[PDB]
Design an enzyme around this catalytic site. Structure first.
Site, short mmCIF file in Angstrom:
data_model
loop_
_atom_site.label_atom_id
_atom_site.label_comp_id
_atom_site.label_asym_id
_atom_site.label_seq_id
_atom_site.Cartn_x
_atom_site.Cartn_y
_atom_site.Cartn_z
N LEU C 167 -7.05 -0.48 11.06
CA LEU C 167 -5.80 0.09 10.59
C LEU C 167 -5.68 -0.13 9.09
CD1 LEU C 167 -4.54 1.07 13.13
CD2 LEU C 167 -3.14 -0.93 13.12
N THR C 170 -9.59 1.77 7.02
CA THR C 170 -9.74 3.24 6.98
C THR C 170 -9.17 3.81 5.67
OG1 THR C 170 -9.27 3.25 9.38
CG2 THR C 170 -9.51 5.31 8.36
N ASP C 252 -1.38 2.67 -2.38
CA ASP C 252 -0.64 2.28 -3.59
C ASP C 252 -1.37 2.54 -4.93
OD1 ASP C 252 1.32 1.17 -5.38
OD2 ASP C 252 1.50 -0.67 -4.25
N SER C 257 4.43 3.62 -12.83
CA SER C 257 3.98 2.33 -13.32
C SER C 257 2.64 2.00 -12.65
CB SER C 257 5.09 1.30 -13.03
OG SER C 257 6.14 1.44 -13.99
N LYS C 259 -1.35 1.85 -11.68
CA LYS C 259 -2.44 0.92 -11.64
C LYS C 259 -3.66 1.32 -12.46
CE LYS C 259 -1.38 -0.92 -6.97
NZ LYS C 259 -0.99 -2.20 -7.55
N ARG C 268 -5.46 1.09 -0.27
CA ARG C 268 -5.45 1.66 1.05
C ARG C 268 -5.02 0.57 2.03
NH1 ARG C 268 -11.54 -0.34 1.62
NH2 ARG C 268 -12.32 1.27 0.32
N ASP C 270 -2.58 -1.61 1.43
CA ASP C 270 -1.24 -2.05 1.07
C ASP C 270 -0.28 -1.74 2.23
OD1 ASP C 270 0.24 -3.28 -1.07
OD2 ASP C 270 1.19 -1.37 -1.40
N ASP C 329 5.48 -0.03 -9.22
CA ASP C 329 4.51 -0.75 -8.41
C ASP C 329 5.23 -1.85 -7.63
OD1 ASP C 329 1.74 -0.99 -7.74
OD2 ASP C 329 1.17 -1.89 -9.61
N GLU C 331 7.16 -1.61 -5.23
CA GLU C 331 7.78 -0.73 -4.24
C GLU C 331 7.85 -1.23 -2.80
OE1 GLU C 331 4.19 -0.26 -4.95
OE2 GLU C 331 4.33 -1.06 -2.92
N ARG C 333 8.81 -4.25 -2.12
CA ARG C 333 10.12 -4.87 -2.15
C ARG C 333 11.22 -3.84 -1.76
NH1 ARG C 333 6.46 -4.73 -3.89
NH2 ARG C 333 5.09 -5.60 -5.39
ZN LIG Z 1 2.70 -1.64 -5.84
ZN LIG Z 2 2.47 -2.17 -2.95
#
Ligand SMILES: [Zn+2]
Ligand SMILES: [Zn+2]
Ligand SMILES: [Zn+2]
Ligand SMILES: [Zn+2]
Lengths: 481, 162, 481
Positions: C167, C170, C252, C257, C259, C268, C270, C329, C331, C333
């Site tokens: 999960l 992938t 992500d 903002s 990366k 992938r 996250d 980034d 997010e 939260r």
């Molecule tokens: Zn982030």
């Molecule tokens: Zn994140």
């Protein structure tokens, strides 16, 4: 004449005073209680209000908020909250007497004469010495005559801190490896004649096969000094000691593995490890605690030069282990590989070491708590309980094999001053030091997140913090008792 | 090869401009008595108007050594040689135009040029190959200091070029 | 026919075998013991040696090192070490049967049939599915017939993990907000018919005034799905639940903002928070645990676009609080500000949430332990004890006011998705989430350092880790019992 910091709690029927102010109200015949009503909304925690001319001999009277009367140990903040209310609150109060330029002030005991004194004294401190432009120098005495040795315990505990703070804060061109040794020796000697100091030089260090410490020193043209402190506290002098160890880079520029210019001026407090613990021994001698303590601190600077320590270098620690020096900014680990070995010579009970070791600790907890890794749950508890009293928290961190493994593999040598990866920063650095220690009750305290204050700790003004000197002193009082 | 490898690999505080010269001379001499070594010092280098080599050396407080290897392989010694040359920075920190800390420990093998070719001459002497070979290697370190080489500087190479 | 993983400990008079191999020795008439002598030095922990043709039906027999027989709970590593020896050791063994391309293998129970099965199963897992170039697919059954439901408990516990792992692992173009929901629903439903799933869409989310979750989703043109899992474990269905919550960003990129390209392909995973907890509920349903659990997971992606979330934005969480979105980034939260609020609807007992939330956690502990901040010492203990059994450690971190303060001051709004400074990274992010929770037994688990494995955990091959799914499952078994 002089000012007065008085205190009040939060509601019951009418928000009560600390008895001294109940008493000062009776004295100006209700006119303090009465003007507080006229002033506005009530004073919550560490908020302040100044009342002029209430008394003939107390022209400015600051009333500060103490919060709940019965505020106690907090399960979440892991401190005694009351004490914390009182510190921020009479610090607040004392900083108001001081902007009014009143050179003296009498402080309300506030139910805990020690928290009041730790607030008034940590609260007011600056390091004014190199500014010809200074604030007024205000003398803070207790208001009253009942609770005197606890207020002096506040003054003692907070003053041992302000010493670590001055020892940290001073520009590293003044605060050298020789000048730190000299102030610590004068401070330890005024504290107790039952002391000995040894500001041991490069020849002694060379002789002590301290290759790791010494490799670090060589970049600078400033002398290394290995400092050795002795406090003969016990009745039988032959009692095994409690040895404190601490890293003393007077200035850290990173060396060849050189730091970025952004705020590098704070590296003058990379001797915070040596400052913290020293200030803590000076205080147990001032306290005249029934224990023999030994203070150990490598002092030197980390500089780039024609003869600085290079990346890739194998140097030898006192204990036969070699270190690949892959990053010249990982030097506190090296400075501490030898002072830690020498600590076992003394046959100790506890070896507490302390160091502004890694910024990753700062990324981790970052001024909340000072990270302490220890192979001793007993030692952990012992530290953690002192943290509850003093308010200068300490948080446990992992001294897992997991981390020894990344530092224990090494292309040229036995150990390597940095780990294979970026992660677990404070943990690899602490698992590198475990390699230089074989004693059962060892504790690394990484001070790098608590190095500085701004607004986070109230009763401490902006600048070097001197944390955790009081937790440390409180531990040696409880251990002696 | 494993000699170039050890000569490369050793931490540059052990593997100096003097220690490399010393191991190469002991290795070339065990290989063939038909050899000569010259671990020529700063005075000789100064004398050889080697301003460019010498400008590089000055940042460090570690001595420069220009190394000179001779293998007398031919029957008639007067045969013209095959000269190997190789750069021998024992450690490269970049100097004032200073390197980033990321993996800079590998700069201990910036003397790989001097190691490679030396190990190769030691082997043709071990092989006792019918040729006269000459091995040449500037050895020194590149460091930042109060007297390091600065950006913008005109130094003079032996050949008059600046 | 097939292979065999046998085991041996470290010295007594002659280093002993796990009884199954003592028994297999008797069987090939001492010729296993005898060839082990002929082979070389003895097998220390998780080291391996393969012996061909000892048996007629066991052509390759791998003997693996189990260490000390009596290896137990370790005060320093905070785990049961035996179990850990056995996992790394039969993983090692099973990976050797597998390079020999033996499609099946019988495993020595090794004194703990569960650790053997958690080693054989976590040990062998890959995610081979998109490579036409795959290793052999080896079936690992127990050797013997005595200890069967503990081996199946190993297979269960390790399989719930390999599900979080698949999960996670992938590519996020396949593993969407809709596809994750679909595999979890098929997995939860095969586990127990006493379940309900709700792959709730944007209209429901919009309706649930989930402005914070929804602000995050809008950058991508990929649909949000808020997932809702129900396991009706209790006898009386009306028992209050234990709600798991988890962040599910399928990919992500940081958004506006944005990366840096360096290794961003790992984002992938996250959605590791949503994967971890889901896999853990699937397993308590597989276990058919006498508790009602609820699984909650915001799923969406974080992308830059003409309608992505901008820096400086005030969005509104379900609970009326506004958030300044200063960094797009931060997010997870925000995704978690709404799923946490919705958790109180369910009237829970414990709200465990989990998220690959911050890299600073990775700087902090970095794959040693998974940082868990909790306003519940009971909950902390409960988690920490499960960590000892499973070996997937969990370390406590500080949910101090100190940190709420830096996130609670805010130019436009009520809370701000990042704190005033760089320090205490995981702590500010966790003290931001405390603002969206009012339940007494809450626990944030930041999974960002344990997101990945390489060499650090032995019985886990390189790639997504699926940590701490088994500690989590072990907690719900102990809580149900
Ligand atoms: Zn982030
Ligand atoms: Zn994140
Ligand atoms: Zn440094
Ligand atoms: Zn340092």
């Amino acid at each position: 004449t002089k000012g007065l910091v008085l205190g009040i709690y939060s509601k019951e029927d009418e928000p009560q005073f600390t008895s001294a102010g109940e008493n000062f109200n009776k004295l100006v015949s209700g006119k303090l209680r009465e003007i507080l009503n006229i002033s506005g909304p009530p004073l919550k925690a560490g908020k302040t209000r100044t009342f002029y001319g209430l008394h003939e001999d107390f022209p400015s009277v600051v009333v500060v908020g103490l919060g709940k009367k019965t505020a106690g140990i907090d399960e979440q903040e892991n401190w005694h909250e009351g004490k914390e209310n009182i510190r921020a609150a009479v610090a607040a109060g004392c900083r108001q007497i001081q902007d009014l330029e009143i050179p003296s002030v009498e402080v309300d005991p506030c139910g805990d004469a020690q928290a009041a004194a730790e607030g008034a004294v940590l609260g007011l401190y600056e390091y004014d010495d190199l500014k010809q432009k200074r604030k007024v120098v205000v003398s803070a005495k207790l208001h009253g005559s009942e609770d005197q040795e606890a207020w002096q315990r506040g003054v003692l505990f907070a003053s041992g801190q302000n010493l670590a703070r001055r020892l940290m804060e001073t520009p590293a061109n003044e605060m050298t490896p020789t000048k730190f040794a000299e102030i610590v020796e004068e401070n330890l000697k005024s504290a107790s004649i039952k002391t000995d100091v040894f500001i041991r030089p490069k020849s002694w260090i060379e002789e002590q096969e301290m290759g790791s410490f010494l490799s670090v020193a060589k970049g600078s043209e400033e002398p290394p000094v290995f400092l050795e402190i002795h406090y003969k506290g016990s009745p039988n002098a032959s009692e095994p000691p409690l040895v404190f160890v601490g890293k003393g880079i007077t200035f850290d520029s990173g060396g060849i593995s050189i730091k970025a210019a952004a705020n590098m001026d704070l590296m003058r407090a990379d001797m915070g490890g040596a400052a913290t613990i020293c200030s803590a021994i000076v205080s147990a001698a001032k306290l005249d605690l029934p224990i023999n303590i030994v203070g150990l601190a490598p002092l030197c600077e980390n500089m780039p030069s024609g003869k600085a320590n290079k990346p890739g270098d194998v140097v030898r620690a006192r204990n036969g282990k070699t270190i690949q020096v892959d990053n010249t900014d990982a030097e506190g680990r090296l400075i501490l590989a030898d002072a830690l070995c020498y600590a076992h010579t003394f046959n100790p009970k506890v070896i507490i070491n302390a160091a502004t070791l890694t910024g990753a600790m700062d990324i981790a907890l970052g001024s909340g708590a000072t990270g302490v890794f220890t192979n001793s749950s007993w030692l952990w508890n012992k530290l953690f309980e002192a943290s509850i009293e003093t308010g200068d928290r300490v948080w446990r961190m992992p001294l897992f094999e997991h981390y020894t493994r990344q530092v224990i593999d090494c292309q040229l040598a036995d150990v390597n001053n940095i780990g294979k990866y970026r992660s677990a920063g404070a943990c690899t650095a602490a698992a590198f030091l475990k390699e230089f220690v074989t004693h059962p009750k060892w504790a690394h305290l990484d001070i790098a997140g608590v190095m500085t204050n701004k607004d986070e700790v109230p009763y401490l003004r902006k600048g070097m913090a001197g944390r955790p000197t009081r937790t440390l002193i409180e531990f040696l009082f409880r251990f002696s008792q």
